[PDB]
């Protein structure tokens, strides 16, 4: 064994050894229980950085832990290679998108292989390859036939800088998710996935996800935004039917989420476009006037027409209001000023009545001043509401529904804030949309036998709109239904399509007859463990659940939910710098290329780019990001310190969910521990070579060696709990450091000492193998001739956890009066102290003090009083 810890020697050799053994290349093996551990795959948008090291080392620790515990572990990696992240990176580096993406993939694969993650590289996928994207084109056509995918014009989110529409989940603070530019509204036709058809299932199935962070589930619940409401019909009065036709002569229909307040409605408000607006305004120019202004600030006019409250018979006047849009669904609303602030305003304004139908506790009701308990929907009971009196919100809701339905005057109605998912993009680098536009047949899907519609890879976008829209060699084609001249769709699919199903593709990435083979889907089931940032909560983590339910309903998979456990690792953060460019954007600058000037107290005041000595903007600590050019490249840390140092630092510096600020001192501290581990094994082997590890009954072992075995097996129990239940890796390392601390203070030079040292060191290197496998593999081979991954996870010897104690009898004047339990090395004075604390001795000494305390070593204490 060499004295110096030399990562450049031992890390390539350990990786070759694992690769040759094919430890990470797995099949559908029914002999071992499956474990599918997945880290969210990266965009080819730059070099990986130490934040990726944290993400992917967490996954590797969990994978290697389960591997040592006898699971069939699939841990796959691949490339989220289509769409805006890869294409924008290519354009920023003046490379064609395809050439950029494939070269960047090769660099990222080199970076990850140097880190020694236990990855099944035979399951590698690149989502920009036709072998991948043909299957999402397939699913698209299947769903398009059923109307679950559809094309429709409408108002959309337009990003003027990325020059594309965006989905609602890609608008962050009114800005595009990659550009940071303010989003505009445009009317552009788009292709949509009808995710609202699955809104109830996507909401309710969140309750299944006991092992997701509550915050992720709450964010998705609020994004879906279910509201249980009530459709309510007010019959039009017999004298207000002039001009109306059809159902609009019969009743006025409204939607409300407070049907518990229906007994308190005092008027209704109607849109300027709703038919009763027109009928009342037909002979009313002062009403056509309001209609014209309309066709915020609440303005309203009475119409003279009246409708009838179905629950109490009240006649209510219909109002035109500018706050009622002809897209409301009904285009008309009821008004309860006593319990809704908006209605309280528009009724205090126009002096419209306010009737109280809710009481919350003993709060007085002032009909002149609004209070926020008027809107309390959780702690209220109904008043002035007939047989609804005394009901709470949920009970009154169901009772109002029964009432309305008994007379056919209403029914429950659910709405959602969720809107359908707009997926088409005016961008080149993405999956082609398998649609052909025929002047005779309409928008027709490309038949399955003609998929994929292949994206040409030799395109350099000119930065002026959709490049495929300028390529008749791509879009001129024949109609698949009639054979006539037609045009391919030139919009492409958004990147989030590929990431919504890649975790199924990993199960059978070479399956050429479908998205995923039935046999492999049945074997791997769902992802047991998913690791990625909380930034994915509203987009990917919602889209992926939706796609899973789609594929299940197509009969491709048999799970309802893609990810069983989710760990959202904290962000590695570091300094950021940029310059404003002449295009109005920001050129981000790596901290390594910056020279800082400081203060008298150490404040960074100015910063310059070393290349030109010209200023840069100090932007402050922020998430390490490829797109902000602030990453620390792990390959450079590996070249200087070794991959194990990079991995150990990221696992030790904080609990995995906590933000982790970059520091060079953290790097050196991790390396010094690895030197300590190396030196500890080297010095042990130097003084006699390896021996058979202690095992079995430990009677006859010295107290110091028993204490070390207690610490050893306590440490195994703790690390096991930390990897397997708590998923906390910093405390596992600290626990092994404490074991080594005790080892250092223990004399292990004797024959039994060396046996215990071997046991300690064999356990330590296995306990740490998931975190720093290179050094642990190498040290194990110097200690022990067997294969580490065949020796398995260390076992807790419960016999080693029993404390060394003795029971001593206490007497008073010779008569035995009790029994005490003392440490095995307790002094004679500890026995005297403990014996005089025995309730038997105290009770039978009768207050008298001891005349003498006879002690027989470790057997008997005799208190003479
Ligand atoms: N600073 C970071 N700390 C921890 N995990 C990170 C960090 N940056 C990215 N990740 C994680 O790495 C995975 C891949 O993300 P991605 O490819 O978007 O990297 P990125 O640095 O965010 O790139 P980009 O800036 O182009 O979005 C995700 O699970 C993401 O949460
Ligand atoms: C699962 C994917 C949406 C992850 C992205 N490629 C990185 O944020
Ligand atoms: Mg369950
Ligand atoms: Mg990212
Ligand atoms: Zn046709």
Residue numbers in the entry: 1 to 295, 307 to 876
Give the original sentences from the paper that presented this experimental model.
To correctly aminoacylate tRNALeu, leucyl-tRNA synthetase (LeuRS) catalyzes three reactions: activation of leucine by ATP to form leucyl-adenylate (Leu-AMP), transfer of this amino acid to tRNALeu and post-transfer editing of any mischarged product.
To understand the role of this peptide-plane flip on the global conformational changes and its effects on enzymatic catalysis, L550 was mutated to an alanine or glycine and the crystallization of both mutants was performed. Despite the occurrence of these substrate-induced changes, including the shift of the priming loop, no peptide-plane flip was observed in either mutant pre-transition state structure. This is likely the result of the absence of the clash between the side chains of E169 of the CP1 hairpin and A550/G550 although the side chain of E169 maintains the same interactions as seen for the WT pre-transition structure.
